[PDB]
Design a protein around this motif. Sequence first.
Motif, short mmCIF file in Angstrom:
data_model
loop_
_atom_site.label_atom_id
_atom_site.label_comp_id
_atom_site.label_asym_id
_atom_site.label_seq_id
_atom_site.Cartn_x
_atom_site.Cartn_y
_atom_site.Cartn_z
N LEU A 125 0.83 -1.20 0.00
CA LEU A 125 0.00 0.00 0.00
C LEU A 125 0.87 1.25 0.00
CD1 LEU A 125 -3.05 0.93 2.16
CD2 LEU A 125 -0.86 1.97 2.74
N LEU A 126 1.88 1.29 0.87
CA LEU A 126 2.83 2.39 0.86
C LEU A 126 3.66 2.43 -0.41
CD1 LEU A 126 4.12 2.13 4.56
CD2 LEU A 126 2.61 3.89 3.65
N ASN A 127 3.82 1.29 -1.10
CA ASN A 127 4.55 1.29 -2.36
C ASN A 127 3.80 2.07 -3.44
OD1 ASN A 127 6.90 -0.04 -1.61
ND2 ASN A 127 6.07 -2.08 -2.06
N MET A 128 2.51 1.76 -3.63
CA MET A 128 1.78 2.63 -4.57
C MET A 128 1.50 4.01 -3.99
SD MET A 128 0.37 -0.72 -4.25
CE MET A 128 -1.19 -0.39 -3.42
N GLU A 129 1.49 4.18 -2.66
CA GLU A 129 1.41 5.54 -2.12
C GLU A 129 2.64 6.35 -2.50
OE1 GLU A 129 0.54 5.67 2.02
OE2 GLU A 129 -1.55 5.06 1.78
N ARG A 130 3.83 5.74 -2.45
CA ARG A 130 5.04 6.45 -2.85
C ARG A 130 5.16 6.55 -4.37
NH1 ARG A 130 7.47 4.54 0.47
NH2 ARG A 130 6.69 2.42 0.85
N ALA A 131 4.49 5.66 -5.11
CA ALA A 131 4.38 5.88 -6.55
C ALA A 131 3.55 7.13 -6.85
CB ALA A 131 3.75 4.66 -7.22
N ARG A 132 2.38 7.22 -6.23
CA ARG A 132 1.59 8.45 -6.27
C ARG A 132 2.41 9.63 -5.78
NH1 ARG A 132 -1.98 9.19 -2.47
NH2 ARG A 132 -0.15 9.01 -1.12
N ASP A 133 3.31 9.38 -4.82
CA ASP A 133 4.15 10.43 -4.27
C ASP A 133 5.19 10.93 -5.27
OD1 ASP A 133 5.79 11.82 -1.87
OD2 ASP A 133 7.15 10.55 -3.04
N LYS A 134 5.83 10.04 -6.02
CA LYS A 134 6.78 10.53 -7.01
C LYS A 134 6.03 11.20 -8.15
CE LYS A 134 7.03 5.78 -8.56
NZ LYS A 134 7.24 4.52 -7.79
N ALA A 135 4.79 10.78 -8.39
CA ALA A 135 3.93 11.55 -9.28
C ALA A 135 3.69 12.96 -8.76
CB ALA A 135 2.59 10.83 -9.49
N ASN A 136 3.39 13.12 -7.47
CA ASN A 136 3.23 14.46 -6.91
C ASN A 136 4.55 15.22 -6.94
OD1 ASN A 136 1.82 12.52 -4.36
ND2 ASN A 136 0.61 13.36 -6.06
N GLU A 137 5.67 14.51 -6.81
CA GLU A 137 6.97 15.16 -6.88
C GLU A 137 7.28 15.68 -8.27
OE1 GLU A 137 8.27 15.46 -3.97
OE2 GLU A 137 10.31 16.21 -4.25
N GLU A 138 7.05 14.89 -9.32
CA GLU A 138 7.25 15.40 -10.67
C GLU A 138 6.25 16.51 -10.97
OE1 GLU A 138 6.51 11.13 -11.46
OE2 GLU A 138 5.84 11.87 -13.41
N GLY A 139 5.03 16.42 -10.43
CA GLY A 139 4.08 17.49 -10.58
C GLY A 139 4.53 18.78 -9.93
N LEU A 140 4.83 18.73 -8.63
CA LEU A 140 5.20 19.93 -7.88
C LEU A 140 6.53 20.49 -8.36
CD1 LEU A 140 4.21 19.14 -4.18
CD2 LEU A 140 3.20 20.86 -5.69
N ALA A 141 7.52 19.63 -8.61
CA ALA A 141 8.82 20.09 -9.07
C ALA A 141 8.72 20.74 -10.44
CB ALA A 141 9.82 18.93 -9.09
N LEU A 142 7.99 20.12 -11.37
CA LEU A 142 7.84 20.72 -12.69
C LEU A 142 7.00 21.99 -12.65
CD1 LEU A 142 7.44 17.59 -15.00
CD2 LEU A 142 9.36 19.19 -14.91
N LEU A 143 5.95 22.03 -11.83
CA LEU A 143 5.15 23.24 -11.71
C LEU A 143 5.95 24.36 -11.06
CD1 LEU A 143 1.74 21.62 -10.81
CD2 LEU A 143 2.20 23.08 -12.79
#
Lengths: 52, 48
Positions: free
Chosen positions: B27-45
């Motif tokens: 569960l935390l593995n796909m949570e951190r997948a969603r997290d690196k998605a938020n990281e590429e989102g926030l970092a690129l924005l």
Amino acid sequence: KKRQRMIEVQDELLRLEPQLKQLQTKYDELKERKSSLRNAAYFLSNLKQLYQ
Amino acid sequence: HLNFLKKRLLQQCETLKMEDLTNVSSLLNMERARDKANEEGLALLQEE
């Protein structure tokens, strides 16, 4: 990063406001300074060049 | 071999979840997948 995003947008909002005011000042100063003398100092002296 | 396996039990239990660890780890593995998605989102924005 999200706090940094809020800070950058706060700078970006401040940067946007400052750039808008600066561009308004730029357009106003361009018009006034560049065209006034090229028209007033032209014509006022051209009127002097005419009359005198 | 079963007696020796009870011996293994008595041998490593003394010295020293799993199903919950596996499920919450995934569960935390796909949570951190969603997290690196938020990281590429926030970092690129933030970068734009």
